[PDB]
Design a protein around this ligand. Sequence first.
Ligand code: POV
Ligand code: POV
Ligand code: POV
Ligand code: POV
Ligand code: POV
Ligand code: POV
Ligand code: POV
Ligand code: POV
Ligand code: POV
Ligand code: POV
Ligand code: POV
Ligand code: FZ4
Ligand code: FZ4
Ligand code: FZ4
Ligand code: FZ4
Lengths: 63, 231, 640
Amino acid sequence: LQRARTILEFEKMLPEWLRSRFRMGELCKVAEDDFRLCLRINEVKWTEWKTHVSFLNEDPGPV
Amino acid sequence: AAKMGKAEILKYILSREIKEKRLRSLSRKFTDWAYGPVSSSLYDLTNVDTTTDNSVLEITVYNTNIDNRHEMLTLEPLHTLLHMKWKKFAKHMFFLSFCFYFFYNITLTLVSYYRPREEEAIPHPLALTHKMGWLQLLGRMFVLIWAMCISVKEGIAIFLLRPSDLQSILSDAWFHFVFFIQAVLVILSVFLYLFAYKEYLACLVLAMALGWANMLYYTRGFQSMGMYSVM
Amino acid sequence: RRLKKRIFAAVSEGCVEELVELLVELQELCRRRHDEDVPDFLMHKLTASDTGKTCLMKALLNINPNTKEIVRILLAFAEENDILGRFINAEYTEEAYEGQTALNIAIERRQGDIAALLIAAGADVNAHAKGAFFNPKYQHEGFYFGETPLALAACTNQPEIVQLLMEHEQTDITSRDSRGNNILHALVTVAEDFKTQNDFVKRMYDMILLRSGNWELETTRNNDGLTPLQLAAKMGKAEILKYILSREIKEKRLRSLSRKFTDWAYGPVSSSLYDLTNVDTTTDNSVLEITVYNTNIDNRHEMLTLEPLHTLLHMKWKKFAKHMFFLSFCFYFFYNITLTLVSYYRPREEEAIPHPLALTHKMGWLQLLGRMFVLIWAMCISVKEGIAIFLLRPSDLQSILSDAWFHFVFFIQAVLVILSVFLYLFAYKEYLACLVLAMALGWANMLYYTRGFQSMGMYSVMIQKVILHDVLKFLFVYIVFLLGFGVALASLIEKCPKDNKDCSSYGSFSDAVLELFKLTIGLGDLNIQQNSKYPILFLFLLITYVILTFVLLLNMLIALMGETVENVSKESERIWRLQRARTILEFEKMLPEWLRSRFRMGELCKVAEDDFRLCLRINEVKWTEWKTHVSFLNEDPGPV
Ligand SMILES: CCCCCCCC/C=C/CCCCCCCC(=O)O[C@@H](COC(=O)CCCCCCCCCCCCCCC)COP(=O)([O-])OCC[N+](C)(C)C
Ligand SMILES: CCCCCCCC/C=C/CCCCCCCC(=O)O[C@@H](COC(=O)CCCCCCCCCCCCCCC)COP(=O)([O-])OCC[N+](C)(C)C
Ligand SMILES: CCCCCCCC/C=C\CCCCCCCC(=O)O[C@@H](COC(=O)CCCCCCCCCCCCCCC)COP(=O)([O-])OCC[N+](C)(C)C
Ligand SMILES: CCCCCCCC/C=C\CCCCCCCC(=O)O[C@@H](COC(=O)CCCCCCCCCCCCCCC)COP(=O)([O-])OCC[N+](C)(C)C
Ligand SMILES: CCCCCCCC/C=C\CCCCCCCC(=O)O[C@@H](COC(=O)CCCCCCCCCCCCCCC)COP(=O)([O-])OCC[N+](C)(C)C
Ligand SMILES: CCCCCCCC/C=C\CCCCCCCC(=O)O[C@@H](COC(=O)CCCCCCCCCCCCCCC)COP(=O)([O-])OCC[N+](C)(C)C
Ligand SMILES: CCCCCCCC/C=C\CCCCCCCC(=O)O[C@@H](COC(=O)CCCCCCCCCCCCCCC)COP(=O)([O-])OCC[N+](C)(C)C
Ligand SMILES: CCCCCCCC/C=C\CCCCCCCC(=O)O[C@@H](COC(=O)CCCCCCCCCCCCCCC)COP(=O)([O-])OCC[N+](C)(C)C
Ligand SMILES: CCCCCCCC/C=C\CCCCCCCC(=O)O[C@@H](COC(=O)CCCCCCCCCCCCCCC)COP(=O)([O-])OCC[N+](C)(C)C
Ligand SMILES: CCCCCCCC/C=C\CCCCCCCC(=O)O[C@@H](COC(=O)CCCCCCCCCCCCCCC)COP(=O)([O-])OCC[N+](C)(C)C
Ligand SMILES: CCCCCCCC/C=C\CCCCCCCC(=O)O[C@@H](COC(=O)CCCCCCCCCCCCCCC)COP(=O)([O-])OCC[N+](C)(C)C
Ligand SMILES: NCCOB(c1ccccc1)c1ccccc1
Ligand SMILES: NCCOB(c1ccccc1)c1ccccc1
Ligand SMILES: NCCOB(c1ccccc1)c1ccccc1
Ligand SMILES: NCCOB(c1ccccc1)c1ccccc1
């Protein structure tokens, strides 16, 4: 919690033009006319095996 | 859920993935692609990332009224956003803050104890004179500015411009005072010497003793060094 | 145009009835050409132009409840136009998907009924998906499974389709991809722990090996040059390496695929034989050699615990490695004493001090045998470590610099003995300075020989763990408490030039810091506290300095008890046994060719018809499970 306070106090020190450069997220079309700044986190799960029907891109890969 | 510390409700809302169609837009967790065991997820950051007035990441860290902030910042977007800010700019700013302050404590010692004079009616340090040299000129100019750059900035923090010292600073942020007191006593000892008082040396020793004492703030850059300083 | 996009969309949501007239509209346009362009033109309108995705690939990526009937319509249309062969065996033209077919899609989407229908329709069961997604760069840019449809069904836990593919006789089980891997190399790569996945990759290894029934799959090496037995030792896959190395097949006609054989059994007492073909250190790359010298994995203690790797590493210690370790101790303990006796046991008045190890006459055979022993043994280390660290296989990329730091300190101590002789003959003033650092490092290197005993060895690891990792935590907080009271006490100390008769101080700040060293180590006085400005105020900062020092010493003990007092004793016990395991295999390389054959383990055991293997015997007494014994080599029990 001492580091987590230190990170957010360093972000307030930055100017307006430099906070936009280090901004996280990307525009992802999650629905019809719904663009959200989403952040990607990958996961490798071996235990549960299901067929995949809920997805945004049918082509797998960071393209 | 971020203000009251309700971690199990805050875990559900922040990672809500609705599989059934026509209610897909009520989700905050989306799967972009999947191939066997490898899958890619997308976490919504509408009111979570620190780009608005009140965000979930800002409320959770600065909440000194709850006792479960470690259980709430462990959650997968709040963990990752707090980790990606460290790798981009916060580790570089923390090391850069260490370099200007470690040079600040040495220069206070070199102007106070590295001058052998017989008596010469002892001059107080940080007193800008001529005929001296650019080595000592760049030294005392660095100490004079950096003592004021802390005193003004901490003068914004503790005082009138959003003082925040009700219970916020006085609970988990006690380092704001000790950087402020050390910055004043450098400036105040110069004012006592120009006003011809006998307390110019006494305020300077407590300024240098508190200056090396405040080096324990920079122990939080490492985990093993940081956990040892908490004990 | 509009005709192409409607066919791609109709196979996506599941409009079965809409797809009917769209294939009729594609069929009504065929009667304006002849048979040279009609099979060509249908490939342009059923596939893409930039990626190569077909209508069959689009329907299988979108799993809908009408996915079974929609495949039967599209494949029947290709049969009527006699284009079924190039339709089902189509591939992506994309660089990140090159080689992926429609069969690779249906296997991953858990469609066993559709994948059985594609193979009967004529799909290629030996498709090689050589794209950039299926062969990643370092980690997690994709998913490497083996680039074959047999490996995709095996690595995604689909045992019904693996049995379907092996019965099909166009399936080449011994196929090798761009990485040189086959079906058994790829199962070692994707394998993980039992907590991580399951034990299913061990069961997939069992099913495929028994169907082949030969020693062709575990003998073939990849482009790197490793067997599937040697990838388990290189990558650190302990659960797969446990299964292969102790594989006992009970069912006959596949008995020769075993690496564990039972020689005899009588009730609870049984005798086993472990195969040592590529395990014992008699070839170039062996399992015992790869596992010990692998500084890229963090589970060497779990792999050398296994029953033949434990026993071979223990039998080498009892035969020659304990005797060589004690003999190395005796020549080096005599080496450190003789350096001291030639340097401090000579009382001479001045006589223009002679440097030691200088061979003169008229001296005696006591000192002659002494200095000749030191001169040779310093060169015997410097040449041998000159082979190790340097040109003759230097190996200092990450191998020596990770778990073998003793190679440098024996080398530096050997040079400084030789270099100090060279500085004295060249008439320089550094002959004595290099000799003291040679003797101080010589007694410091006696901690290498602590690994002969367990209790002595575990204690020396804890010393190396505190100094290299945990002392800089103590020091960096000590100096800020040193200089915190250092600038405070320096203003209290009255200046030394009061008399200047015995004044040899180094400054006001230097007097305050040096007294805080002496008061910590226990050599402090009270001469400055009496002759100070404020004597009572000078004492209270010294009392506070002791309290802060005791807090620093008391939190070092809590930090060395981090979260469990047992796990500190565990990590010093695991990495001690790797220091002995490296020491055993380095002593084996020192032996000549005729002497390694004398201490070789194993014996010829006829395990099958014309199958003689160097097996090692390990006895076992098991009381829990009671079975009748039908799998045995000798019907007469006993070591005869
Ligand atoms: C005359 C008597 C002789 C000396 C007495 C013995 C001195 C030995 C002192 C040793 C220091 C350690 C214990 C002190 C108290 C904790 C540190 C602190 O200030 O709080 C904060 C800063 O912590 C930092 O890391 C920044 C500065 C550290 C030292 C500040 C000076 C303290 C001495 C004062 C005067 C010394 C005299 C200087 C001359 C004027 C802790 O960080 P936080 O962000 O708030 O989060 C934790 C919240 N919590 C703690 C509430 C859980
Ligand atoms: C001037 C300052 C005053 C003295 C300072 C205090 C000295 C006190 C020192 C105390 C020794 C203990 C800590 C030292 C570092 C660890 C031991 C080591 O070297 O590595 C190896 C040697 O394995 C040995 O144990 C043999 C030699 C031990 C001492 C080597 C000299 C180090 C002194 C330095 C110069 C002293 C001056 C000598 C004169 C030139 C450890 O074995 P390993 O096979 O690599 O496996 C472990 C791998 N791991 C560690 C990466 C996990
Ligand atoms: C406008 C344009 C500007 C130009 C460009 C600007 C950019 C250039 C900026 C910077 C230049 C280049 C930097 C590159 C990255 C290095 C940063 C780094 O090392 O991180 C360190 C931060 O830094 C510190 O923590 C320093 C403080 C030392 C720790 C304790 C000593 C102090 C207390 C005792 C007193 C002793 C002192 C002596 C006695 C008084 C540590 O971070 P980390 O550990 O690596 O993080 C990993 C997290 N982990 C912990 C989980 C592992
Ligand atoms: C890293 C740990 C050790 C740190 C260094 C050891 C500490 C001290 C080193 C040595 C002890 C004393 C020997 C001489 C001191 C240097 C020169 C001098 O005399 O100072 C003079 C000015 O001083 C200043 O105003 C500027 C500071 C000078 C640079 C020294 C610290 C650099 C550390 C970088 C830190 C940045 C962070 C780095 C990233 C971590 C003092 O004035 P003077 O009385 O008139 O002296 C006359 C002599 N003269 C004419 C020749 C000038
Ligand atoms: C030189 C550079 C410096 C480097 C130093 C090292 C350099 C060399 C590197 C490594 C060698 C280290 C020493 C040898 C091995 C020691 C370990 C050991 O176990 O001892 C074994 C010695 O081995 C024997 O079997 C004894 C045979 C001696 C007869 C020699 C005559 C012919 C060889 C010609 C000789 C000249 C060579 C060829 C020249 C023409 C004894 O076995 P044991 O276990 O004790 O079993 C007894 C137990 N029991 C009685 C209960 C049954
Ligand atoms: C070419 C023909 C050659 C002729 C024939 C050649 C053959 C004849 C050869 C040899 C002659 C006969 C030997 C027979 C077997 C005895 C050896 C032995 O005991 O093994 C010892 C090895 O040896 C050492 O470890 C010595 C080092 C002592 C450790 C601590 C002192 C060093 C550091 C402190 C500094 C203090 C020193 C003073 C201050 C500087 C230990 O092994 P073990 O423990 O018994 O093994 C059991 C494993 N256990 C751990 C599970 C229990
Ligand atoms: C085991 C723990 C204790 C170790 C022993 C205690 C340490 C020391 C014992 C006593 C302290 C000093 C008293 C006299 C020293 C002996 C003789 C001498 O004078 O040395 C001389 C030569 O020295 C050499 O070159 C050879 C070494 C001599 C044998 C001594 C160590 C044997 C240990 C075996 C270890 C192997 C491994 C064993 C397995 C573990 C010194 O030369 P000098 O200055 O000209 O002296 C003139 C006197 N003189 C003419 C009479 C020669
Ligand atoms: C200018 C820049 C800033 C400079 C100031 C700061 C510099 C940084 C200084 C200390 C912080 C450590 C940073 C290392 C890398 C970061 C990763 C990390 O988390 O640290 C870890 C990596 O452990 C190490 O690598 C220790 C660093 C020393 C390496 C060897 C130097 C020789 C020691 C010479 C010694 C002196 C000779 C002795 C006699 C006099 C440390 O973790 P740990 O401590 O092992 O905790 C484990 C305990 N537990 C499992 C129970 C929890
Ligand atoms: C964690 C790291 C370490 C932490 C910090 C280390 C411990 C910090 C503790 C103490 C810091 C140092 C205290 C003394 C400083 C001045 C000494 C001096 O020079 O005396 C001189 C100045 O004379 C005076 O004016 C003051 C004399 C002492 C006043 C004592 C009050 C402070 C006690 C502590 C309470 C403070 C509360 C602190 C908060 C708890 C006397 O010299 P003179 O020639 O006879 O008189 C002529 C005057 N002239 C020279 C200017 C012309
Ligand atoms: C990594 C630390 C070790 C290396 C850096 C050393 C840092 C400095 C530490 C100690 C000083 C050692 C070198 C400086 C000058 C020589 C001696 C001296 O002090 O006396 C001088 C005045 O005496 C004073 O009163 C000056 C001391 C105050 C300024 C020095 C501390 C700087 C910041 C604190 C440390 C910040 C960094 C600490 C972070 C850990 C006069 O010298 P002399 O007595 O007449 O003798 C002649 C000198 N000669 C023979 C050498 C020619
Ligand atoms: C962690 C515990 C360590 C202490 C606090 C740690 C922080 C330390 C910081 C600041 C501490 C406070 C600084 C006080 C300065 C001394 C002034 C004084 O007393 O008058 C006189 C001494 O007269 C005496 O002799 C009094 C006896 C001294 C000890 C008291 C007995 C304790 C019994 C009760 C049990 C309670 C035990 C204590 C409470 C725990 C004069 O003393 P002087 O000034 O040196 O002489 C100069 C003359 N001049 C002024 C005319 C020039
Ligand atoms: N498992 C450790 C996760 O660490 B957390 C963390 C995240 C980013 C940077 C540094 C640490 C963390 C956990 C609770 C509160 C605050 C931060
Ligand atoms: N001195 C004005 C700001 O100080 B900084 C600062 C002040 C007190 C505590 C911690 C940091 C600073 C921040 C980032 C980089 C460099 C310095
Ligand atoms: N149960 C203790 C077995 O010890 B092992 C061992 C084997 C031979 C000689 C000495 C020790 C061992 C275990 C893991 C790694 C390396 C060696
Ligand atoms: N000095 C040349 C070889 O040294 B040996 C050696 C040198 C350094 C560290 C460990 C061993 C040696 C090995 C076995 C028996 C005797 C000596």
